Design a protein around this nucleic acid. Structure first.
Ligand SMILES: Nc1ccn([C@H]2CC[C@@H](COP(=O)(O)OP(=O)(O)OP(=O)(O)O)O2)c(=O)n1
Ligand SMILES: OC[C@H]1O[C@@](CO)(O[C@H]2O[C@H](CO)[C@@H](O)[C@H](O)[C@H]2O)[C@@H](O)[C@@H]1O
Ligand SMILES: OC[C@H]1O[C@@](CO)(O[C@H]2O[C@H](CO)[C@@H](O)[C@H](O)[C@H]2O)[C@@H](O)[C@@H]1O
Ligand SMILES: [Mn+2]
Length: 580
DNA sequence: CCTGACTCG
DNA sequence: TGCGAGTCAGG
């Protein structure tokens, strides 16, 4: 605990070195158009601190940040780049991101600051962000001397830990995953974040108005059937109405009381018609509060755009998450909700929304990884397994399978491949638990390869302590040999799923890098807007639609090569809704 | 702040 | 007693 640094007045030559650690401190958790409160640099020549109004105005510093031959090591470089694009400054030459490096080494650590990453290497010369800035309503940037030291210490740490982290990544054969997949992707996400998505507020406000009219309607109806007023959005009061006043049977409890989950409500339908009305009310209430009122609170009024943050170092399987707003969970399943998408539009004049989508991506990953004959064959002829399961459950034929019921048989295929027990399956389809068992038992005799993959990956996880995905992403399962049935089972199901979801996650990540490449090389104006786990979303001038119909799917299928082919569905239209 | 509800993959 | 997420209302 003793460090020398220079609290600089101006940018000097010795700070513009070819290799350095860089800290562009942004305290606000949502970094979009957020204050940059301090800058630090560590290189061969020394340790420096700079005030932002100094460094960001000095054209030489800006030129050094923008030069990709001047290599930077950073912690969460997406935060920096974005907070810099809002200051009209471009960041280039990031060769090491400690955050991503740490997330690949172990997603469970849930690293959020340099101190926690340093924790993994015994490096103790840096304080965590909360012990410096404060918590919640106390969150305060301290006095400069304190601020400076801390930032310099963060650089110093990034500076000392680069090699160790890279050294460990090389042993696990995860170095190329960092440098060639994750890190390049970080910059792409920073663009999509900054470009934003344009929203039709006029339309959005009109719908919430209509939604309110329907909410009051359904609501009155609910009080009439119940013969009283209560708070529908209060599960405790609703529970009293349904199970105490109305006497409806209790199908399930939780640790705090009676259950009123959608699943329980659908099963209570024969007994009383208020349950269906509650379901419908809850549906509309969510649309209003989250997808109208939530969404309008985060639009930037001047440009009518929303800017989400794609949290890259958070999920345990390798997926991304989307926050403030979440644009990866916009309604589509029920026609009423699906309408919200009409308000998502192109940002320019004659531009359109292109939406490409992988077909059964996790079922193909399972096929490739488990090497199952009957499964690999079905895909080679181009059978639709969801449609092959739609019939099998809905007694129907291929000729009449509505999109609605290809989604309900979709969750059965996936459910089965991810350790759903017969209790789960029967409780999802309202069928006999004996019949549920039969389905599964048949499935594993029909696909013996998939069954043995399940047995094997659990065995391997017990022996190794972890599982891995195609591009060597890793998840550790320390609870895998727990004596407790519940604890053991949960980790076992993670040993089944992770390699699959994680692999689909790797693939679509790679597909984005190649797409971005194939875009800038062909000099097109088209650019990525969103990723929703297994689908990409772009906007482009009307003219470019021809190339994209050929380009986008070609890139997504050619990303990786598997023991089965990869298929992509695509559509375009003037609204994200019409892109169906 | 947590629990349970809804939303997506 | 299928997996991975986020946000919101009530208590
Ligand atoms: N009920 C569901 C739906 C989705 N998923 C996970 C596993 C698959 C991954 C992608 O699913 P979708 O994009 O919904 O469908 P797909 O099978 O990948 O492709 P398609 O749209 O052609 O059915 O998300 C899941 O576990 N359970
Ligand atoms: O930018 C995402 C990146 O930031 C970190 C901390 O450096 O997470 C913080 O910001 C997130 C996005 O706003 C919040 O969800 C989270 O609460 C906060 O810790 C990284 O963990 C994350 O990858
Ligand atoms: O360095 C990580 C990198 O290794 C890759 C690419 O070479 O996988 C290769 O090495 C693996 C074992 O050494 C094999 O599974 C594979 O056959 C081989 O291509 C990437 O998957 C990984 O990111
Ligand atoms: Mn898909």
């Amino acid at each position: 605990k003793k460090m020398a640094f220079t609290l600089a007045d101006r940018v000097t030559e010795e700070m513009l070195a070819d290799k350095a650690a860089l800290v562009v401190e942004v305290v606000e958790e949502n970094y979009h158009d957020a204050p940059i409160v301090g800058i630090a640099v560590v290189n061969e020549h020394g340790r420096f601190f700079l005030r932002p109004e100094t460094a960001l105005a000095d054209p030489q510093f800006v030129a050094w940040l923008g030069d990709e031959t001047k290599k930077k090591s950073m912690f969460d470089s997406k935060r920096a780049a974005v907070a810099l694009k809002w200051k009209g400054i471009e960041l280039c030459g990031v060769s090491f991101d400690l955050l991503l490096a740490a997330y690949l080494l172990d997603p469970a650590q849930g690293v959020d600051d340099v101190a926690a990453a340093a924790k993994m290497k015994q490096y103790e010369a840096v304080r965590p962000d909360e012990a410096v800035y404060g918590k919640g309503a106390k969150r305060a940037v301290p006095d400069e001397p304190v601020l400076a030291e801390h930032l310099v210490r963060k650089a110093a740490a990034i500076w000392e830990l680069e090699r160790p982290f890279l050294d460990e990544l090389r042993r696990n054969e995860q170095d190329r995953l960092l440098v060639e997949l994750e890190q390049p992707l970080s910059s792409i996400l920073a663009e999509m974040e900054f470009a934003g998505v344009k929203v039709d507020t006029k339309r959005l406000e009109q719908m919430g108005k209509e939604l309110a009219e329907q909410l009051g309607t359904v609501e009155q109806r609910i009080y009439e059937l119940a013969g009283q007023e209560f708070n529908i959005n209060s599960p405790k009061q609703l529970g009293v109405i349904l199970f105490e006043k109305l006497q409806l049977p209790v199908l399930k409890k939780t640790k705090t009381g009676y259950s009123t989950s959608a699943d329980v409500l659908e099963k209570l339908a024969p007994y009383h018609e208020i349950v269906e009305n509650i379901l419908h009310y809850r549906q509309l209430g969510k649309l209003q509060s989250t997808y109208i009122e939530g969404l309008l609170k985060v639009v930037r009024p001047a440009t009518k755009k929303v800017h989400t943050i794609f949290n890259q170092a958070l999920t345990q399987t390798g997926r991304l998450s989307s926050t403030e707003p979440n644009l990866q969970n916009i309604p589509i399943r029920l026609e009423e909700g699906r309408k919200i998408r009409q308000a998502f539009v192109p940002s320019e004049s004659d531009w359109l929304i292109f939406a490409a989508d992988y077909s059964q991506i996790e079922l193909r990953v399972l096929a490739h990884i488990a090497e199952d004959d009957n499964l690999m064959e079905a895909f080679r002829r181009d059978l639709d397994i969801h449609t092959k399961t739609a019939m099998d459950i809905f007694q129907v034929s291929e000729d009449e399978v509505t999109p609605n019921m290809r989604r309900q048989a979709k969750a059965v295929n996936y459910g089965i491949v991810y350790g759903i027990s017969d209790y789960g399956l029967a409780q999802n389809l309202n069928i006999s638990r004996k019949e549920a068992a039969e389905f599964i038992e048949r499935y594993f005799e029909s696909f013996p390869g998939v069954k043995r993959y399940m047995e094997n990956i659990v065995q391997e996880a017990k022996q190794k302590g972890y599982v891995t995905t195609l591009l060597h992403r890793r998840r550790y399962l320390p609870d895998i040999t727990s004596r407790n049935f519940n604890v053991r089972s949960f980790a076992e199901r993670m040993a089944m799923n992770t390699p699959i979801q994680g692999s689909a996650a790797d693939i679509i990540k790679k597909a984005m890098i190649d797409l971005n490449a194939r875009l800038k090389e062909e000099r097109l104006q088209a650019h990525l807007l969103l990723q929703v786990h297994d689908e990409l979303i772009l906007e482009a001038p009307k003219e470019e639609m021809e190339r994209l119909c050929r380009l986008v799917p070609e890139v997504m299928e050619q990303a990786v090569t598997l023991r089965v082919p990869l298929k992509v569905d695509y559509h375009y239209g003037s609204t994200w809704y019409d892109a169906k």
